[PDB]
C-alpha cells in the first residue's frame, strides 16, 4: 500500500489538473477543485496533501499542508454526485491500486462510489461518481513533495 | 470515542457470555463465539482483544492477545447472517457509544449491519444482523484488562 507522507495528486484523464483547496480558504464547506499547478516545483500549501494510515488496512485520512483542512463529503451525504469540501473533521477513504503502473482510485469504504473530475475546464469541482473498470477520470497519480 | 487499549467484551442481552476465539486455535477461518469466562479474573488470551484507532475518526482494528488473530467477516462477504472468524488480515469496524453506559455497538462502516449474539446457549457463533436501536443482542460492555 501507499507510504504515509506528503504528495501532489494529478488526474489520469487530465494530467494538467492537481487536487486544490479553493483560494487557500480555511472556512467550513470551501470547494475542492481540479486546477493548474500554481508555483514550481510543488505548489503552495493548498496543492500538498498529507496521508495518515490505519495499519494492516487500505483506510486513510487526507489533510492539506496550509491551511490544515481535511478532505470531507459535504454534510456526510454519501450518494452519487455529492460535493468534496475542506473541513475541521475528515471522511475516512480507501486508497486502492488500479494495476502495475502507479495509478489509484480514492473510494468511499463499502459503497461502490469514488472521487471523479467531470471536465478539463480549469476550476471544475470534484464530486462522487459510480465505480467502474474503464473511466480514466476516476484514476489518480501520487508524487512525493521533499518539502523543506 | 473509546480509548485504545486491551478489553474483555461481554453481551448486554446475555451478561454471562464473552467474545471468544474457539479453542485458542491460530488457523485461518476459526469461528468467533459467545462463551462463559474461562479464567479468573480476566480469561486466557483468546478472551482479551486489543483496539488500534485511526485518529479523528471512529474506525478501529480488533486483535486477540494469544494467538494474535484479527476479527474478520468470512470471505469479506458484507451481508445479513455472515460468520465472524479469526484471520491474518482484519475487517475495519466502526465502534460507537449506544444504549447507555460502558455500552457500545460494533458496526460495519457505511452499511446497516452490526455484530450480534442470537442465543444464550454456550458456544453459539457470533454473526452479522440488521441494525435495530431497540435490540440488546447487538449491544456490548467493554472492561479494561486488570494490571496483574
Ligand atoms: O479560484 C481558485 C484559485 O484561487 C487562488 O487563490 C486566489 C483567490 O481565489 C482570490 O480570492 C485571491 O485571494 O487571490 C488568490 C491568488 O493570489 C489559488 O492560489 C489557486 O490555487 C486556486 O484555488
Ligand atoms: O470449545 C470452545 C472452547 O474451547 C476451549 O478450549 C478447549 C478445547 O476446546 C479443547 O478441545 C481442548 O483443546 O482443551 C481446551 C481447554 O484448555 C477454550 O478454552 C474456550 O475458551 C472455548 O473456546
UniProtKB/Swiss-Prot annotation, chains A, B:
<dbReference type="GO" id="GO:0042803">
    <property type="term" value="F:protein homodimerization activity"/>
</dbReference>
<feature type="binding site">
    <location>
        <position position="23"/>
    </location>
    <ligand>
        <name>a carbohydrate</name>
    </ligand>
</feature>
<dbReference type="GO" id="GO:0030246">
    <property type="term" value="F:carbohydrate binding"/>
</dbReference>
<comment type="subunit">
    <text>Homodimer.</text>
</comment>
<feature type="modified residue" description="N-acetylserine">
    <location>
        <position position="1"/>
    </location>
</feature>
<feature type="binding site">
    <location>
        <position position="38"/>
    </location>
    <ligand>
        <name>a carbohydrate</name>
    </ligand>
</feature>
<comment type="function">
    <text>Lectin specific for terminal, non-reducing N-acetylgalactosamine (Gal-NAc)-containing carbohydrates including N,N'-diacetyllactosediamine/LDN (GalNAcbeta1-4GlcNAc, LacdiNAc). Specific also for carbohydrates containing N-acetylglucosamine (-GlcNAc) or N-acetyllactosamine (-Galbeta1-4GlcNAc) at the reducing end. Agglutinates human blood group A, AB, B and O erythrocytes with a strong preference for group A. Agglutinates bovine erythrocytes with a very low specificity. Binds carbohydrates bivalently, which is required for its biological activity.</text>
</comment>
<feature type="binding site">
    <location>
        <position position="20"/>
    </location>
    <ligand>
        <name>a carbohydrate</name>
    </ligand>
</feature>
<feature type="binding site">
    <location>
        <position position="46"/>
    </location>
    <ligand>
        <name>a carbohydrate</name>
    </ligand>
</feature>
<protein>
    <recommendedName>
        <fullName>Ricin B-like lectin</fullName>
    </recommendedName>
</protein>
<dbReference type="InterPro" id="IPR035992">
    <property type="entry name" value="Ricin_B-like_lectins"/>
</dbReference>
<keyword id="KW-0007">Acetylation</keyword>
<feature type="region of interest" description="Involved in dimerization">
    <location>
        <begin position="109"/>
        <end position="111"/>
    </location>
</feature>
<keyword id="KW-0430">Lectin</keyword>
